[PDB]
Design an enzyme around this catalytic site. Sequence first.
Site, PDB file in Angstrom:
ATOM      1  N   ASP A   1      -4.381 -12.626   3.646  1.00 28.38           N
ATOM      2  CA  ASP A   1      -5.670 -12.190   4.168  1.00 28.38           C
ATOM      3  C   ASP A   1      -6.847 -12.577   3.278  1.00 28.38           C
ATOM      4  O   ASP A   1      -7.987 -12.259   3.625  1.00 28.38           O
ATOM      5  CB  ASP A   1      -5.687 -10.677   4.431  1.00 28.38           C
TER       6      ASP A   1
ATOM      7  N   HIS B   1      -6.132  -7.325  -0.759  1.00 29.82           N
ATOM      8  CA  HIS B   1      -6.296  -5.914  -1.087  1.00 29.82           C
ATOM      9  C   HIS B   1      -5.476  -5.554  -2.322  1.00 29.82           C
ATOM     10  O   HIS B   1      -4.407  -6.106  -2.555  1.00 29.82           O
ATOM     11  CB  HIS B   1      -5.881  -5.009   0.080  1.00 29.82           C
TER      12      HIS B   1
ATOM     13  N   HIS C   1       0.797  -1.221   0.000  1.00 34.44           N
ATOM     14  CA  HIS C   1       0.000   0.000   0.000  1.00 34.44           C
ATOM     15  C   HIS C   1       0.835   1.280   0.000  1.00 34.44           C
ATOM     16  O   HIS C   1       0.287   2.349  -0.284  1.00 34.44           O
ATOM     17  CB  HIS C   1      -0.920   0.016   1.216  1.00 34.44           C
TER      18      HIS C   1
ATOM     19  N   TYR D   1      -4.118 -11.953   8.750  1.00 33.02           N
ATOM     20  CA  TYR D   1      -4.387 -11.562  10.128  1.00 33.02           C
ATOM     21  C   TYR D   1      -4.950 -12.658  11.018  1.00 33.02           C
ATOM     22  O   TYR D   1      -5.173 -12.403  12.203  1.00 33.02           O
ATOM     23  CB  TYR D   1      -5.314 -10.330  10.136  1.00 33.02           C
TER      24      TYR D   1
ATOM     25  N   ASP E   1      -2.316 -10.850  -1.955  1.00 34.11           N
ATOM     26  CA  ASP E   1      -3.020 -10.225  -0.847  1.00 34.11           C
ATOM     27  C   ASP E   1      -4.451  -9.909  -1.289  1.00 34.11           C
ATOM     28  O   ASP E   1      -4.708  -9.646  -2.465  1.00 34.11           O
ATOM     29  CB  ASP E   1      -2.248  -8.956  -0.440  1.00 34.11           C
TER      30      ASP E   1
HETATM   31  C1  LIG Z   1     -14.519   2.083   5.478  1.00 34.52           C
HETATM   32  N1  LIG Z   1     -13.065   1.791   5.819  1.00 34.52           N
HETATM   33  C2  LIG Z   1     -12.795   0.837   6.979  1.00 34.52           C
HETATM   34  C3  LIG Z   1     -11.220   0.747   6.955  1.00 34.52           C
HETATM   35  C4  LIG Z   1     -10.747   0.491   8.421  1.00 34.52           C
HETATM   36  C5  LIG Z   1      -9.282   0.007   8.615  1.00 34.52           C
HETATM   37  N2  LIG Z   1      -8.754  -1.005   7.628  1.00 34.52           N
HETATM   38  C6  LIG Z   1      -7.235  -0.753   7.617  1.00 34.52           C
HETATM   39  C7  LIG Z   1      -6.473  -1.758   6.819  1.00 34.52           C
HETATM   40  C8  LIG Z   1      -5.438  -1.419   5.932  1.00 34.52           C
HETATM   41  C9  LIG Z   1      -4.731  -2.427   5.239  1.00 34.52           C
HETATM   42  C10 LIG Z   1      -5.028  -3.798   5.393  1.00 34.52           C
HETATM   43  C11 LIG Z   1      -4.228  -4.917   4.552  1.00 34.52           C
HETATM   44  O1  LIG Z   1      -4.198  -6.050   5.004  1.00 34.52           O
HETATM   45  N3  LIG Z   1      -3.576  -4.596   3.250  1.00 34.52           N
HETATM   46  O2  LIG Z   1      -2.874  -5.511   2.428  1.00 34.52           O
HETATM   47  C12 LIG Z   1      -6.103  -4.101   6.309  1.00 34.52           C
HETATM   48  C13 LIG Z   1      -6.813  -3.102   7.018  1.00 34.52           C
HETATM   49  C14 LIG Z   1      -9.145  -0.740   6.226  1.00 34.52           C
HETATM   50  C15 LIG Z   1     -10.598  -0.329   6.010  1.00 34.52           C
HETATM   51  C16 LIG Z   1     -10.805   2.127   6.360  1.00 34.52           C
HETATM   52  C17 LIG Z   1      -9.565   2.815   6.406  1.00 34.52           C
HETATM   53  C18 LIG Z   1      -9.374   4.083   5.793  1.00 34.52           C
HETATM   54  C19 LIG Z   1     -10.464   4.671   5.131  1.00 34.52           C
HETATM   55  C20 LIG Z   1     -11.701   3.981   5.089  1.00 34.52           C
HETATM   56  C21 LIG Z   1     -11.931   2.689   5.698  1.00 34.52           C
HETATM   57  K   LIG Z   2      -3.608  -8.065  -4.292  1.00 33.42           K
HETATM   58 ZN   LIG Z   3      -4.240  -6.993   2.708  1.00 31.33          ZN
END
Ligand SMILES: CN1CC2(CCN(Cc3ccc(C(=O)NO)cc3)CC2)c2ccccc21
Ligand SMILES: [K+]
Ligand SMILES: [Zn+2]
Length: 357
Positions: free
Chosen positions: A264, A173, A133, A304, A171
Amino acid sequence: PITGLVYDQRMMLHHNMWDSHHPELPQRISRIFSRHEELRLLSRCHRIPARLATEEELALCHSSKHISIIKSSEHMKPRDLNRLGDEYNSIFISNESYTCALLAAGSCFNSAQAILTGQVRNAVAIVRPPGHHAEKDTACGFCFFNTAALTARYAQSITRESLRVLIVDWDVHHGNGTQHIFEEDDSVLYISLHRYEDGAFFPNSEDANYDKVGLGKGRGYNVNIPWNGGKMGDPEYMAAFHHLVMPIAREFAPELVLVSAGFDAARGDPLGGFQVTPEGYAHLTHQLMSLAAGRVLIILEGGYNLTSISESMSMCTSMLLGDSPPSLDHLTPLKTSATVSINNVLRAHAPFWSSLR
Ligand SMILES: CN1CC2(CCN(Cc3ccc(C(=O)NO)cc3)CC2)c2ccccc21
Ligand SMILES: [K+]
Ligand SMILES: [Zn+2]
Ligand SMILES: [K+]
């Protein structure tokens, strides 16, 4: 035919001092390393030392301003660490975060060098914090520097500029940072599979969609495989590999394969919502081993569920060691939306890849 493994307990020092239960836990890497021992995979690998990435190496992908801001967090008071974190999407920072991000990057550099000099054939990197990211100018989504993108540039820096690097990002994401860093680059082919849900899944940008194929010289060298319509698993990922990832990768003919291997999308992940099994990941690993004369580096990203990620990455290393792939269950009927996704990717990239015609 040797497999390298890099792991350093120092990378556990990065922690969330405001929520010790945050899912990007230090124990992610210690649990994966422990499972490699218990299954007696560790003694079959050649151990590769971690090292600190240098500031110059970070400059292969990142702006000097971004580097020095993260560097400065090393001596921040807790209130300044907390303010700084809130200036990024999904980032916590402790005084050790900068050093852990350098350790993850340099660990992968040593691994790529070991591979490209022939000390080993392939390798696994059990590292944190993750990377894909992170953008040229900013941290994001638990990531400070883009470990995979930096390793691709590092590999080119010790071989030649035009070294053909494939980055497969499985991943759950989209790796927005990796896409952006190589968007106009035709020497690094980026292929991402990710939960998309028409932009509703993190990181919530239409950049993740199938029609973002790259820019200028990089057209065709960015392949987004976006999943819509809920839970995906082994059948969909197997078909994406058979119909898209492997046909394109063979036409590209990488000289090095980096896997942005977040786990994940695994069954049991509390965030991904997918069902990919450890045997599923074994089979994706096995397929990629047919590329680049076997020169494959597996780099831990997200993931996770401590048991799920420990079983899944262990299976990948088992494949790298030459073990025979475990049997798979019932790959036949895909979800309709996954067939549609694959057909959209085929339509987007058939102009650039004859193997897709
Ligand atoms: C509506 N959402 C909810 C959410 C809450 C927090 N998580 C954080 C996150 C980041 C990376 C990975 C990963 O594993 N990447 O490979 C997993 C979790 C993401 C989604 C969020 C953050 C910022 C803006 C809007 C929103
Ligand atoms: K990916
Ligand atoms: Zn991820
Ligand atoms: K690219």
